[PDB]
From Swiss-Prot:
Catalysed reaction, written as an equation: O-phospho-L-tyrosyl-[protein] + H2O = L-tyrosyl-[protein] + phosphate
UniProt KW Nucleotidyltransferase keyword: no
Effect of L229H: In NS1; increases MAPK signaling; increased protein tyrosine phosphatase activity
Organism encoding this protein: Homo sapiens (Human)
Keywords of this entry: Acetylation, Cytoplasm, Deafness, Disease variant, Hydrolase, Nucleus, Phosphoprotein, Protein phosphatase, Repeat, SH2 domain
Protein name: Tyrosine-protein phosphatase non-receptor type 11
Residue numbers bearing the Phosphotyrosine modification: Y58, Y62
Compartment(s) where it occurs, according to its Swiss-Prot or TrEMBL record: Cytoplasm; Nucleus
Assembly, per entry: Interacts with phosphorylated LIME1 and BCAR3. Interacts with SHB and INPP5D/SHIP1. Interacts with MILR1 (tyrosine-phosphorylated). Interacts with FLT1 (tyrosine-phosphorylated), FLT3 (tyrosine-phosphorylated), FLT4 (tyrosine-phosphorylated), KIT and GRB2. Interacts with PDGFRA (tyrosine phosphorylated). Interacts (via SH2 domain) with TEK/TIE2 (tyrosine phosphorylated). Interacts with PTPNS1 and CD84. Interacts with phosphorylated SIT1 and MPZL1. Interacts with FCRL4, FCRL6 and ANKHD1. Interacts with KIR2DL1; the interaction is enhanced by ARRB2. Interacts with GAB2.
Domain notes: The SH2 domains repress phosphatase activity. Binding of these domains to phosphotyrosine-containing proteins relieves this auto-inhibition, possibly by inducing a conformational change in the enzyme.
The family this protein is said to belong to: Belongs to the protein-tyrosine phosphatase family. Non-receptor class 2 subfamily.
């Protein structure tokens, strides 16, 4: 669960919540009053606020480490005591009762129209009735409305138990379905889908999401679902693999990691299946050889670099390619940089990859280096990114039996997830045309189960909508 995250509270509300309802070791996370986060912890009768920064690459904790998600951050510190500091301990989550980041909560709602149009057997939603709530379910086919009485800070369906939150009530009736007199089981199988749009109606959705914003609420609801993606990252934790990670706590899921054929099988990279991708971190001096072994083994012919080598005076990715016209050996792999072409937003490098001692293994690898992405945030216009993805897509499509496209930035989750998701969404619109259904958070949740924290910020999330809108507008 992710109940420790409170989306609509202030620092004072957090302090009073922790002092009156928590104990020593009580904690909560919250958005900054913007784009930053606060971890508030009770220690020796007093509340300590710790800043968490995300500019689009990773969650950066003051006095701690860098993480792919807030859930991974909390999971780590709740398991590894002494790592946060005077040591600060995360013992007890202080649960949030606010239903705003729940998939099924639709405040003011109409609900019968949505359930009849979009719904199926077990599709449900919760809405605001005075101060009371309504649970509306579809079964088959028909729609049933259950009143939810709010009586003295507690919620109930007219009898039995009284829950401290709508979430507790929903979860209880999810596991224990209400049975109507004549036998209809009020199965709450899945929340009603309200995010799937028809591609031709994107400008309408972007307009509604821009109203007081809706983009923030939709993104935080997606963030609440990240607690279901805490898959094992054991291989990245091995002693022999620690120095192969750019960030010690940003690791690849074992079940999707690229396996390389003493301990020569590891790279911090994952296969992303929607044309497949490999999402990876920027090379380290000690991982350049593992990087070319991955490119060669996977039969990849296109590499997308979405970062400069150095940003804000800090190394983001080492130069893993030779200078123009030069030849270099990276272990068993040989790379020639044949030609470099400069365009406004990017540089194209035509590389020739082969295994040393075997000439017939040679293939051209096209490296598309996007150089104009800002240090913080996202571009103000998606046209540059869209023209770039269009060219990358056409190169990939022209090469018979080409392997997955290699995509990397620094940690390989923010800008990498953003470029991949845009590329997945636009591909549906290429194959199926303007008359197709696209579901942005569904696409992201799917990519995120293949690599942690793919798409880092709300600014990137909004950029994905703007990019899809722009692609459809130029169709
Ligand atoms: O063994 C399994 O089947 C299994 C299943 C689900 C999982 O989430 C994991 C697991 N994978 N990584 C982690 N980390 C991260 C970590 C540990 C050490 C060094 C760096 C990093 Cl960044 C956790 O802190 C963690 C904490 C509690 C419970 C599982 C955890 N876990 C393993
Ligand atoms: C007002 C509200 N609380 C905010 C927006 N909203 C929703 C609903 N569903 C998703 C969704 C869709 C597909 C996959 C995933 Cl994981 C998610 Cl979470 C979403 N992001 N927002 C509706 C309720």
């Amino acid at each position: 669960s992710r109940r420790w995250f409170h989306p609509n509270i202030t620092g004072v509300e957090a302090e009073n919540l922790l002092l009156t309802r928590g104990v020593d070791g009580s904690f909560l996370a919250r958005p900054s009053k913007p784009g930053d986060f606060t971890l508030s912890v009770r220690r020796n009768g007093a509340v300590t606020h710790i800043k968490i920064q995300n500019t689009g690459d990773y969650y950066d904790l003051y006095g701690g480490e860098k993480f792919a998600t807030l859930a991974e951050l909390v999971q780590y510190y709740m398991e590894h005591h002494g790592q946060l500091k005077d040591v600060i301990e995360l013992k007890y989550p202080l649960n949030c009762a606010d239903p705003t980041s729940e998939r099924w909560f639709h405040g003011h709602l109409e609900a019968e129209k949505l359930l009849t149009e979009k719904g199926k057997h077990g599709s449900f939603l919760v809405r605001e009735s005075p101060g009371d709530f309504v649970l509306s379910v579809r079964t088959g086919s028909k729609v049933t409305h259950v009143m939810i009485r709010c009586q003295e800070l507690k919620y109930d369906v007219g009898g039995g138990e009284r829950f401290d939150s709508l979430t507790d009530l929903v979860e209880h009736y999810k596991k224990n379905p209400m049975v109507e007199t004549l036998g209809t089981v009020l199965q709450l199988k899945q929340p009603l889908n309200t995010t799937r749009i028809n591609a031709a109606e994107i400008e309408s959705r972007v307009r509604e999401l821009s109203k007081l914003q809706g983009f923030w609420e939709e993104f935080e609801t997606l963030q609440q679902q990240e607690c279901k993606l805490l898959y094992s990252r054991k291989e990245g934790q091995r002693q022999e693999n620690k120095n192969k990670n750019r960030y010690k706590n940003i690791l690849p899921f074992d079940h999707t990691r690229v396996v390389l054929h003493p301990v020569s099988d590891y790279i911090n990279a994952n296969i992303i299946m929607p044309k497949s991708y490999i999402a990876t971190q920027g090379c380290l001096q000690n991982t350049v050889n593992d990087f070319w072994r991955m490119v060669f083994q996977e039969n990849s012919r296109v590499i997308v670099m979405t970062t400069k080598e150095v940003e804000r005076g800090k190394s983001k990715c080492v130069k893993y390619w030779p200078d123009e016209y030069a030849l270099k050996e990276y272990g068993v792999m040989r790379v020639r940089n044949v030609k470099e072409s400069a365009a406004h937003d990017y540089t194209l490098r035509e590389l020739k990859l082969s295994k040393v001692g075997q000439g017939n293994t040679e293939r051209t690898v096209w490296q598309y280096h996007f150089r104009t992405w800002p240090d913080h945030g996202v571009p103000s216009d998606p046209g540059g990114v869209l023209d770039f993805l269009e060219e990358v897509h056409h190169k990939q499509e022209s090469i018979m039996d080409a392997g997955p496209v290699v995509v990397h930035c620094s940690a390989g989750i923010g800008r990498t997830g953003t470029f991949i998701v845009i590329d997945i969404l636009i591909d549906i619109i290429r194959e199926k045309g303007v008359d197709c259904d696209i579901d942005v958070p569904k696409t992201i949740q799917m990519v995120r189960s293949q690599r942690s924290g793919m798409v880092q910020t709300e600014a990137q999330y909004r950029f994905i909508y703007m990019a899809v809108q722009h692609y459809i507008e130029t169709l």
